[PDB]
Amino acid sequence: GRVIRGQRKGRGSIFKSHNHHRKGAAKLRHLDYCEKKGYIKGLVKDIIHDPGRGAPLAKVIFKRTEKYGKKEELIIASEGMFTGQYISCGTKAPLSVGNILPIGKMPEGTLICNLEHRTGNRGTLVKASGCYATVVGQSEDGKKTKVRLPSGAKKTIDAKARAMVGVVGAGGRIDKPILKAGVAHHKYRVKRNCWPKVRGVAMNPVEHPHGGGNHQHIGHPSTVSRSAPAGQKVGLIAARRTGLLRG
RNA sequence: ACGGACCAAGGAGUCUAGCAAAUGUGCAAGUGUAUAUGAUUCUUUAAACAUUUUAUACGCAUAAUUAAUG
RNA sequence: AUGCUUUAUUGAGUACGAGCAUAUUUGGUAGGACCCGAGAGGCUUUGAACUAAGCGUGAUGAGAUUGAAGUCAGACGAAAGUCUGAUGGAGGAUCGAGUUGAUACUGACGUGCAAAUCGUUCAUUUCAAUCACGUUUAGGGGCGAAAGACUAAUCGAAAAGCCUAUUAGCUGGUUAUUUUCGAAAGAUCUCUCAGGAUCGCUGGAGUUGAUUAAUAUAAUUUUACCAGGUAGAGAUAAUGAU
RNA sequence: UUGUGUUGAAGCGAAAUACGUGAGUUUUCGUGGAACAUCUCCCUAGUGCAGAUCUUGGUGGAAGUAGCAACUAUUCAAAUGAGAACUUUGAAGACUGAAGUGGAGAAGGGUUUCUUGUCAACUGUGAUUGAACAAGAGUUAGCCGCUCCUAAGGGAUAGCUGAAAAGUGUUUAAAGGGGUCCCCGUCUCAAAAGGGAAACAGGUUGAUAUUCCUGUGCCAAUAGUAUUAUGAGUUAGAUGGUAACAUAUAUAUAAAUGAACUCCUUUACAUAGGCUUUACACUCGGGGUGCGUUUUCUUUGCACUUUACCU
RNA sequence: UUUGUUUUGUAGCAAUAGUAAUUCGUAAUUAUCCGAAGUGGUAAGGACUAUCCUUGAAAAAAGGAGGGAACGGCUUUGUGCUUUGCUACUCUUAAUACUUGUAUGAGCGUACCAACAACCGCAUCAGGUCUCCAAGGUUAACAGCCUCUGGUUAAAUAGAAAAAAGUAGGUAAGGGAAGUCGGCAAAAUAGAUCCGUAACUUCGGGAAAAGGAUUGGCUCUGAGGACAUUAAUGUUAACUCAGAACUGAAACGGACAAGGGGAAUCCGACUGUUUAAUUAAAACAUAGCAUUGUGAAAAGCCACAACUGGUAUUAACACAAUGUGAUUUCUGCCCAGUGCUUUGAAUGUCAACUUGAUGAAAUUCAAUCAAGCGCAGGUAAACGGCGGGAGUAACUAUGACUCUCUUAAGGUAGCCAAAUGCCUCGUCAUCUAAUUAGUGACGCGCAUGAAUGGAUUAACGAGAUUCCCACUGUCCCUACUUGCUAUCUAGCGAAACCACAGCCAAGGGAACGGGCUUGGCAAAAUCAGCGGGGAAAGAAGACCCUGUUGAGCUUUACUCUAGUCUGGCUUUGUGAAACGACUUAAGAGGUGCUACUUUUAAAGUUGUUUUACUUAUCCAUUUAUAGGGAUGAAUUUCCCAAUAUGGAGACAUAGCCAGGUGGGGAGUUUGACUGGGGCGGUACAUCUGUUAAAUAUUAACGCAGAUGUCCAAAGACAAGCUCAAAGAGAACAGAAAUCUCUUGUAGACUAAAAGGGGAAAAGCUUGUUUGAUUUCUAUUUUCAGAACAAGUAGAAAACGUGAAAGCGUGGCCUAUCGAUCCUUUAUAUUUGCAAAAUGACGUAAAUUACUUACUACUGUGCAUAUAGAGGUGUCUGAAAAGUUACCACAGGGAUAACUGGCUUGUGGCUGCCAAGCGCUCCUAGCGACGUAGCUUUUUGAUCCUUCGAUGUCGGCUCUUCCUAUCAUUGGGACGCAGAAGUCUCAAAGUGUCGGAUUGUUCACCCGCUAAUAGGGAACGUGA
Ligand SMILES: [Mg+2]
Ligand SMILES: [Mg+2]
Ligand SMILES: [Mg+2]
Ligand SMILES: [Mg+2]
Ligand SMILES: [Mg+2]
Ligand SMILES: [Mg+2]
C-alpha cells in the first residue's frame, strides 16, 4: 500500500547530511612536478576537530613554486604529528611518520594510511580513525604493489600511487560504552537523520513486509535474494549463512 | 408497521430514430417528383405552384432457391 | 450433355399478381427515457497560517535538598597500605512555583460560557528540555520514538472543478367524472430462488356462422360395452411374521 | 365563424325557490378599474395534486413558558434631562496587589483616534451612555527603523533531456568582474529579534514627538584653479627611552614619503559552577522646609531635598 | 620643582532647567537644593575551574605589517634623453574668489487597539494568542495573605420572599469499612531543630525508612570582626547561633503554607514517547547483545519519464538491512519440508538468432557451452519443529530395570493451575469466625520452555492485585446550618416535538388499545412538584441475512506489469597466431562400370577462441603551470632523444529484439439449495418399488435402494434338450466327489438396483455367422406439445440363418448421457480463391503464322458443403483464492440474536390400582410393574408482531398481587404415656434478617432467630 521508510531515503529531503559546521574536504596534494621528480616540504600549523568525523585533521601550509605566495591543505592526521613539524611530500622523500611517498618505495611490513587506489586520485582508501594497511608484496618489475586492507581483503595497486606513513589518529574509540540514549542523540545530531529505529514487526502491513499479525512474528523466511525489487529487499540480503559464527 | 404541525404556488410515461399490427385516405402492376432546377414566386412567402422542348436517377414491390460456378 | 429418370426428400416456392405512399394510437429496442436516490472509477489543478519531521537565526526555566572525583590537615604501620575532620561542586540526581500537559472525581455542564469549556486533584522544571519567526518535504504521495496516527472542525487514501443528468434485478412518489368487461399467485427453461423469457388466465379489433323452439354444443343423466387392485377380507391359498 | 365592455372587463368575497347522477355550467349583490370570449367546426401542448423525511415562501400550539447564575459589593446627596439602579460631580465602604484590567512593542485589524452634535435601528433590562449615527480634523526625522551584508534556502544564465508543458543547474562558456595596459573570477532575491556611520536634556497640542520649539553635540560627503593664513620637514622623506614602549594640544593632537605583489587581525560566537567590582533599586540616622495628631502620649508620623548625552 | 593654607568650582554641561516653599498684583519677586552609613534584589564586565564518540555561522566593511617602484623646483639650444643660475621647494588643515547644469543631508512608515468589547473562534463568546520593566510587611521564596504608586468599583437585568429539590461548602454523640465490584469521595500527616533508623542490595542506595522530643511572649548571659594612640587604652558596626530565669484557662510552623505509613505478589530495567475530541499502558523508543551486504565513480542501499541524483565536505573504529531489549546466570536437539546460498561443458531439460537438408517457392525438418530449474554441498541469534503401548522389587503402592511399535529430531537446563490448566471453586498448608479472592508448595503441563529469548533481579512507576496500622457521615441512621438557583413581582424573551388526540377493566384483533364490543363511571377554570405510561424524542439498525453494489489488507487464486539477471544484432576500427568446418588419391569393407561409412603437405573460401595497437567510446585531476635519468626570509651543474596529463580500450555504456525471476505494483473473481447463515449433505442430470386416495397427474433435507459401467459374445438364426431340490441304491467314499432310478409349475437360470416376462423357451449345449450395416418417413415418452436423448411402426439396397413359413436395423422390457465457436479425419463426374493461364499445343487439319475446329476427367497452400469424433457431472453448457475486531452503500421483520402468542417433548406439581415394606398388619407412614391429569417460576420446537431502532447481565431503592403455608390462630390422625415430631383441614390478617468469597443469577460456609417459604407484574423497575 504505502512506500517504505527505506525507500523514502533516496528522495533526499530530510535525509541529507548535516554539515553546517564542517570544515572542508580531506584531500592529498595535487600531483605536480615536484612530487614526481623530487620532494617538497610543508609546515603543520594546527590540528583541528571536525564535527561529523572522529579522526582529527592537520592544517598544513606549503609554499608556492610557480609564483610568490602560500597555499593551504587539509589532511587526515596520523598519530604522532605535532604543531611545528615539517613533513615532506614527493618521490624522493625519506621514510618517516607523516611523510607522503609512492607505495613502490616502501619496504615490506610498512604501515600506511590515506592511500590512493588510482594514481593522482588525492586519496580514498584508509581514512577512519584507528585504521591502517600493510605492504605485503612488491612486484618483480615494479609497476605493481600488493597491500592488505583493514577489512582483511588483499589488493594490487599501481606502484606510483601515494600514501602516508603511519596509522590514523584517535584510534580505539569504540571501546567506551555509550550508556545513555542522550549520548546517541548527540552523536547522530551532527551526522544525519537515522535515529531512533522502529522495527518492522511493530508496524501495520501497509508499511512493511514484517507488519501485522496477532503475535508479533515475521511469518516469512527473513533471508531474501539479490534480485528482489526495492520495496521487498528488507530482511537479510543475499545471506550465505545465518546463526552464531564459530570460527 | 413507516410518511404526514398548517396554508399558498411548483411538481412526474414525454421527444427523436427504426420496425410491426390496427384503422382512415389516394392511386394501382405499379407507386413515391430524392438532391436539384423553373417561374410575370417574393410583407406574409422559410409557404404555395411547376418538372427538363416506342421518354433507362434511386428506393420498395412485381420470383424463387443454393456455400457456390449458377 | 441444351445431361436424363415416376422414383423419395426439402424450401421463408409457384399454379391469371396487391402493392407503394401518408395520418394517428399501441407494443417492444436504443438513447437522461415516468420522477428523485448511492457506496464507487477516471482527468486536471489548490493547500504544511493547524498539525508531523529536518534545518537557519534568536530568546526562556522563583526558591530549596543531596553531596562524586580532585585538594589540605591529623592518627596508625617495617613496607604495602588503612582510618578521622574539613574543602570542593559531579549527576539524562531529589522536592517544588511558573511553563508544558492531562491521572481521578467515571464532579459540573451536556437547548453549554465552549462543535472539548469550568473546578478541585494529578504529571513535568539542566535536559532525548521549552517557545518565536524564517525555510524544505504534496495525494496511492509526504511525514510517523508506530496509535493506521497526522497532512486547515475533512484521512484504512485531502480539498476544488469536470467526464456526469455515470449505473441500480432495490426503497418512496405518480394529478378530473360517470359507464361497460374483469385476473393471477400453476407450469417449462434460466450463475436461477426479492428478477426474466415462454404457456395458461383478461381486454380490445375483425371476419365466418346461427337467427328455421334446428343442427353444431354440454364440469348432467339413460341404454350397450370396456379398463382397474384402493376401503373390506385372508392367514388352514403363495411370501414374510407369530 | 359571430360576440361582450367607462350606461364598467378579468379577478376576488358572500350567496342562489337555478340546472346536471357527477367532474362542472349559469346567474345576484359587493369590491375592482381594463380588457375578455367563441359550444359553429377544427388544430395544438411545458394541460388537471393530499401525500414523494418533495422544492421555495409565509404562519401556528408549545408560551408570556425554558431562561436572562463564573469574575467577593454596594450606599447617601447633587447636576442634567420628557424620562436616571447601570451618564457626570462630591462623600463613604471595598477590589486589583508589580507573575496587576499598570506602562511599552510584534503578528492581525484599518480610522475604531480627537472636537462638536446627537438617538430611527443596535448597545439580549433601562439608557440622556457608546467602539452606534452625522459634520469637520489629526500622523513633521541626516542621528528611530526599512533601504545595505550574508544564512538555512528560492529564481535564473551555459549546457543537457523532453512532442511540448516542464526537469536540472558549469556536468569541458571564447561569459561576469575588478585593477589601468593587467589580473581576478557566474547573476539575482531571502532577517523591521543575526551583522551594522551618527543625539541628548527641558518645554509644548483637543489629537504627534529621541521627528515640533529652545539649547548644546555628533556622523558622512564636499571638483578644478588661484590667493591668504595653521603647523612640520631640507639647506629624497622628524625624534626620546637600557627595555616593555612614548611623542604633533594648531579655535581643531591635521601632516613622521612610499608603487606591484604578499601575509595577518577586528567583525566572530557552546554550557555548568562559585568568587569579585561598579551602576540602578531598597533601607538607617543627622540639617532645612511644608503638612498631620494632640482628653492622655510623642525632641513625634509623612513629603521634597534632582543633574542627561558630549569634552 | 615645595608646605598647612592662600580660596574658589556641584570640573565644563549647570541653573538660566526641574522640585518643594513664602510671596505682592490685574507677566510679576524671594529662601533651600547638604551631612554619615547599611542590605543585597536586577544588569553588565573581570580573572578562573570543569564538561563533550556534542567542540558550539558567514559576508559587507575596517585596520596592521613585509618589500622598495618613483621622485629636490622654475624658462634656458636639440631629438622623453642632450646645455647655463638660485641650494625658496614638499606636505598638511581652515577660509575666501572664479570657472563649472541649479555644489548638504533622498524616498517610504509614524494616528489608535493589542484583547479588559478593536485579532481568530458566525457575536461586544468565562476559549486561544510572541517579548521587556517590577515597591513595603511576613518568609527559604518573584509562593500564599495584607498594603503604597498607577488602575477600578464592571460584567445579556433588578426588588422582595425564603418551603421542597439541586449545585458549591461546614459540623455531628457511641461504633470505626459492618457500605461498595472496589476505602470511589473525604478525613488523618505536613515547616524547622535535636535524637534514632531494618530486610535487602548492582555497595552507589533503600531513607524524609519506621519511630521520639521541642517550638509563644518578656527580662538577661555567652560566642563569632574592622580601625588608631602602642601587649595597654579608644572608637565602631551586620546578622546569626547557644544557654538561664519568669509568665499564661497547657497554649505557641496558632491564620496562610504543608508527605499518610508498613508486609508481600505480577509487568516493564531506568530518565524518555503515544491514539488533538471515550484507551497514558504491560504498548513505542533506549543503552547492551547478535546476524547480513559492500574495497567504489563498471561497488552496496535508495530516487528519476529521460537527462541525472541521495548517502557523500563519505571510505570497513564506514555506510546500508534486520531481530532481541540494563545488570547477573544461561542460551539444549533437528538441514528431511519451505527459503537463502556455492561449484559447472562430465551433465537432462530450457528462447530469439545462426547453420545445414529437402523443395519450383512459401513452408517442413535437424544441429548448436545463455541465464533459470535438476544433479552435488553449506546454513537454525533463517520460517519453523522437538512420540506411543506393555511387564517388572519378600504386605500394599511405585517402577530404577526389560520388551516392542516408531521420527528429520522426539521438549534438554529450567519453570508452573502463572496476564499460559478445559475438567476446576484441582490437592495440601497459611491467612479469617466464615475465603470461587491473596500467598507458599505439588505436577502424565486440554495447549509451559530458551535472542518468537528461559530463570532471576537492587533502584524507579498518575501501571494490575492481597493483608495490617492510623483515619474518618461509606455505613448503623439520619439531623442542623451558609452562599448561588428554583419561588412571586417590573422588563425582555427562544427551541425540540406535533395524523387527530388524551380516565379505566375484560374481550376479540397483525397473537400487549386513546379510539372498536360489553360494563365501571362521568360537572367549569387554575398553581407547584414528579418520573408509571404515550411499545416518548434523536437517526432511512453499525449486529444478522440478501445484492451476479464497493473498498482496505494477504497469498504457492486468475491474468498482467516497473525493476533486476541472461543471450543476439547495431554502435565498431587496425594487425597476428592456433584450432574448426565444406574436395584431392588413399582406408578396410560389406554391395548388381556402380551404390554408402571409414587414419593423411587442401581442391579455396568462412567460423567460435587467444594476443597486440590507438584514433572511436568511457573514467579521474588541475589555475589543464618544467620532455626522461644523476614553527625566520625567499617575488620587480652533468647524461638521455625532438593529441593537457594519467588510467581503461574496441571491452563496458547505449538503442531494438528474446528468455528467467518478479503481491514491490495494477485489474478482477471467489455457484445454488438450505426449517437464519456456516459446517454436513446433493434431495442440482437420471432409474426401480412405496407414500399416491382401484384411468392418468401429484410435495418435503419423506421411506428402502441403484447409475457415469460391462459384453466377438453375454449380439443373429436354427436344432436338440430340461432346471433347484428330495428319497432310495453302488469298491475305496464319510455331511459334501462319480453313477442309476422315482417325484418335481420353476422352489433354478437369465452381466449389474428393484419390479414385470419366460418350460418341445427368453434357460442349458451344439452348428453356421457379423442386421451392433447405408438412406428416408409417420410418430411415443418428458412437454411450450421446443432441442437433445431413449423407444415403436414402416419403406429403398445388400446379406445371415433355416428344409420352409419366417426372424434379424445390438443386449427379454424398464436407467447407463451432451449446444454454438474451434480443431480433426472421411466422402464427392458437387464448388470457390474476383483481369487471366498451369493435365497439354492432346487429337485432326493447315502452313509460310497472333491459322482453324474438337475435349466429362488440369499446380502447392487455404476456404466451403455433408458425416462421425475431441466437453461442458453447476449435466439447455462463465476461463476464477482468502480475510476485515478499520469499514462503506441499497434494502429485508420475505430471515437470526429479547419480551409477548400457540404447543408442553423436557423441567415442576397432583391423582388411580395394589405386588411388597412396615416383627405380626396391603392403605399410621409409604408404594414396585402400569396408568389419568394440571401449570407456564426450566429448556426446547416454530417464525405471527418489531431491522427509516421497543436501550441489551446483575445489584440498590419502592409498591402491589398469587398460594402450591416456613412461622404465628383454631382443629382432625398416628406405629399418640409425657416431651419432641410426622400426615392433614379452614385460613394470605402479621412477619420472613447481619456477614466472609464471586460481576454474578445460582452456589457454599459463620451467626442470630419464631421463621430465616416459594413465586408474578415487557425475565417489574437505566429521561
Ligand atoms: Mg500496532
Ligand atoms: Mg505489504
Ligand atoms: Mg514479542
Ligand atoms: Mg506458526
Ligand atoms: Mg419502510
Ligand atoms: Mg413524522
Ligand SMILES: [Mg+2]
Ligand atoms: Mg396500413
Ligand SMILES: [Mg+2]
Ligand atoms: Mg434497402
Ligand SMILES: [Mg+2]
Ligand atoms: Mg433521471
Ligand SMILES: [Mg+2]
Ligand atoms: Mg473499476
Ligand SMILES: [Mg+2]
Ligand atoms: Mg506553521
Ligand SMILES: [Mg+2]
Ligand atoms: Mg518545525
Ligand SMILES: [Mg+2]
Ligand atoms: Mg531530574
Ligand SMILES: [Mg+2]
Ligand atoms: Mg463526567
Ligand SMILES: [Mg+2]
Ligand atoms: Mg480540566
Ligand SMILES: [Mg+2]
Ligand atoms: Mg489495529
Ligand SMILES: [Mg+2]
Ligand atoms: Mg444520479
Ligand SMILES: [Mg+2]
Ligand atoms: Mg361482472
Ligand SMILES: [Mg+2]
Ligand atoms: Mg376566462
Ligand SMILES: [Mg+2]
Ligand atoms: Mg406538468
Ligand SMILES: [Mg+2]
Ligand atoms: Mg398546482
Ligand SMILES: [Mg+2]
Ligand atoms: Mg399542496
